[PDB]
Amino acid sequence: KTYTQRCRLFVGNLPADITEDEFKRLFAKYGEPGEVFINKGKGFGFIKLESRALAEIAKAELDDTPMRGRQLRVRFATHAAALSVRNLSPYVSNELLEEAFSQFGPIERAVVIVDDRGRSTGKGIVEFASKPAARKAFERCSEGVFLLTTTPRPVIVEPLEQLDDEDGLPEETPPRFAQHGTFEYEYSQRWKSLDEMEKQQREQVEKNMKDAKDKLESEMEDAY
Amino acid sequence: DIKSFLKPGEKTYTQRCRLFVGNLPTDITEEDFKRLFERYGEPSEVFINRDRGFGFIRLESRTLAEIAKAELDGTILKSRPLRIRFATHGAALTVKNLSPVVSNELLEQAFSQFGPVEKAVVVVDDRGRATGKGFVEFAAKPPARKALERCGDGAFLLTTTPRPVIVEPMEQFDDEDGLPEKLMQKTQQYHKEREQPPRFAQPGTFEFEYASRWKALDEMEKQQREQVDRNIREAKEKLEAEMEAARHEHQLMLM
């Protein structure tokens, strides 16, 4: 299981004079290079190494290192060809998920997300070897109606929404608890009851549509 | 001996460096367990339950823990593959209603009043914009429960704006092992659901009608969710305008 999406690194703050040879040379001690990509205009690149361990070493040893007077930004970029899959029956296994989406392109991983107790959350992740394979799966399942099991509940397919939790947001009144009776107390209390209304309105929508979806499930189960 | 691979500002032997090791041989000793990981340098919190077949090990850094997991996961040690996972982070919380002024460092020093903080990050999206969501990871669980209780009963204000943050436990999910086929019991209910294979519903069948009606309801739910946000933005703007008007009237009243 080599040169996977889990072995892909992003390289930011590159110089404009960068060549494919100079980029490859940066990763020369970390085995044979895989698929290389460079956006010379925006100054960023991508590289796949043989293993996750080599990507781990390369990333640690090259991030925040200079190159032609520029400080490199080296990070993992492992979600380009990943897709989120929703509305899975609890009888959808990792292997069934894999078999269902294999028709759109070669698969690296397909996994059903389970909770703290090991039960299906009704959601899965399908990661393809290439971006167009993920793209094809996404369009086919949006235009068409893809069923995984006997119950004709269609799978909802979206590109894997991946947020930055590695870099984050770095660099007038200090943190504190609102004091009883002050101006900021009334205002913060107004926010507490606004947040409660939002929670209430959202739990209602989720419920009234769960009920609408369950009533259709009754007709689905009846039809059988 | 072995490089540390510590990231800038990274603390050592954190909960993010802790590995769970399962399916060990029943004859394993504390010396035989240390040997499996000695190539990753000095460990700190070595635990082994020889009887049950599992252990815990802390490595210096997250990179060393990632290398050890990528190399040693699923490798045979006496007719059985080891199961190596990051230990479930016991003291992790999520922070909502954050001001776009709140930094990683401000979030760390703010929650650092409840106890020692391993890591604090303010979540950003693809473009690098302040989502409003963040997360705090404590070195031990106690401080995490104090943070959760106080921030819920009182109003915790990180900045000048009296907008209190929302503190909830970090939801723990498994996207590694999932639901394998071998552990699904072959019940009649399993057989009824697995009888029809993955397929695109054919237009004109009962299936296509039931499925298309399901997609229309899911589209309706999304529209309703966007409608609640519409109502929240309205309620939010009226509150901001009311409290700005009150603060201004008060400033005009001070001698």
UniProtKB/Swiss-Prot annotation, chain A:
<feature type="modified residue" description="Phosphotyrosine; by ALK">
    <location>
        <position position="3"/>
    </location>
</feature>
<feature type="modified residue" description="N6,N6-dimethyllysine">
    <location>
        <position position="24"/>
    </location>
</feature>
<feature type="modified residue" description="N6-acetyllysine; alternate">
    <location>
        <position position="48"/>
    </location>
</feature>
<feature type="modified residue" description="N6-acetyllysine">
    <location>
        <position position="29"/>
    </location>
</feature>
<feature type="modified residue" description="N6-acetyllysine">
    <location>
        <position position="131"/>
    </location>
</feature>
<comment type="subunit">
    <text>(Microbial infection) Interacts with M.tuberculosis protein Rv3654c, which probably leads to the cleavage of PSF, diminishes the level of caspase-8 in macrophages and suppresses macrophage apoptosis by blocking the extrinsic pathway. Part of the HDP-RNP complex composed of at least HEXIM1, PRKDC, XRCC5, XRCC6, paraspeckle proteins (SFPQ, NONO, PSPC1, RBM14, and MATR3) and NEAT1 RNA.</text>
</comment>
<feature type="modified residue" description="Phosphoserine">
    <location>
        <position position="193"/>
    </location>
</feature>
<protein>
    <recommendedName>
        <fullName>Splicing factor, proline- and glutamine-rich</fullName>
    </recommendedName>
</protein>
<feature type="modified residue" description="Phosphoserine">
    <location>
        <position position="89"/>
    </location>
</feature>
<feature type="cross-link" description="Glycyl lysine isopeptide (Lys-Gly) (interchain with G-Cter in SUMO2); alternate">
    <location>
        <position position="48"/>
    </location>
</feature>
<feature type="modified residue" description="Phosphoserine">
    <location>
        <position position="84"/>
    </location>
</feature>
<feature type="domain" description="RRM 1">
    <location>
        <begin position="7"/>
        <end position="79"/>
    </location>
</feature>
<comment type="function">
    <text>DNA- and RNA binding protein, involved in several nuclear processes. Essential pre-mRNA splicing factor required early in spliceosome formation and for splicing catalytic step II, probably as a heteromer with NONO. Binds to pre-mRNA in spliceosome C complex, and specifically binds to intronic polypyrimidine tracts. Involved in regulation of signal-induced alternative splicing.</text>
</comment>
<feature type="modified residue" description="Phosphothreonine">
    <location>
        <position position="78"/>
    </location>
</feature>
<feature type="domain" description="RRM 2">
    <location>
        <begin position="81"/>
        <end position="162"/>
    </location>
</feature>
<comment type="subunit">
    <text>Heterodimer with NONO. Monomer and component of the SFPQ-NONO complex, which is probably a heterotetramer of two 52 kDa (NONO) and two 100 kDa (SFPQ) subunits. The coiled coil domain mediates interaction with NONO, and can also mediate formation of long, linear homooligomers (in vitro). SFPQ is a component of spliceosome and U5.4/6 snRNP complexes. Interacts with SNRPA/U1A. Component of a snRNP-free complex with SNRPA/U1A. Part of complex consisting of SFPQ, NONO and MATR3. Interacts with polypyrimidine tract-binding protein 1/PTB. Part of a complex consisting of SFPQ, NONO and NR5A1.</text>
</comment>
From Swiss-Prot, chain B:
<feature type="region of interest" description="Sufficient for perinucleolar caps localization and interaction with NONO">
    <location>
        <begin position="166"/>
        <end position="255"/>
    </location>
</feature>
<feature type="domain" description="RRM 1">
    <location>
        <begin position="17"/>
        <end position="89"/>
    </location>
</feature>
<comment type="similarity">
    <text>Belongs to the PSPC family.</text>
</comment>
<comment type="subunit">
    <text>Forms heterodimers with NONO; this involves formation of a coiled coil domain by helices from both proteins. Found in a RNP complex with CAT2 transcribed nuclear RNA (CTN-RNA). Interaction with NONO is required for its targeting to paraspeckles and perinucleolar caps. Interacts with SFPQ. Part of the HDP-RNP complex composed of at least HEXIM1, PRKDC, XRCC5, XRCC6, paraspeckle proteins (SFPQ, NONO, PSPC1, RBM14, and MATR3) and NEAT1 RNA. Interacts with ALKBH5 (when acetylated); interaction with acetylated ALKBH5 facilitates recognition of N(6)-methyladenosine (m6A) RNAs.</text>
</comment>
<feature type="region of interest" description="Sufficient for paraspeckles localization">
    <location>
        <begin position="60"/>
        <end position="255"/>
    </location>
</feature>
<feature type="domain" description="RRM 2">
    <location>
        <begin position="91"/>
        <end position="172"/>
    </location>
</feature>
<protein>
    <recommendedName>
        <fullName>Paraspeckle component 1</fullName>
    </recommendedName>
</protein>
<comment type="function">
    <text>RNA-binding protein required for the formation of nuclear paraspeckles. Binds to poly(A), poly(G) and poly(U) RNA homopolymers. Regulates, cooperatively with NONO and SFPQ, androgen receptor-mediated gene transcription activity in Sertoli cell line. Regulates the circadian clock by repressing the transcriptional activator activity of the CLOCK-BMAL1 heterodimer.</text>
</comment>
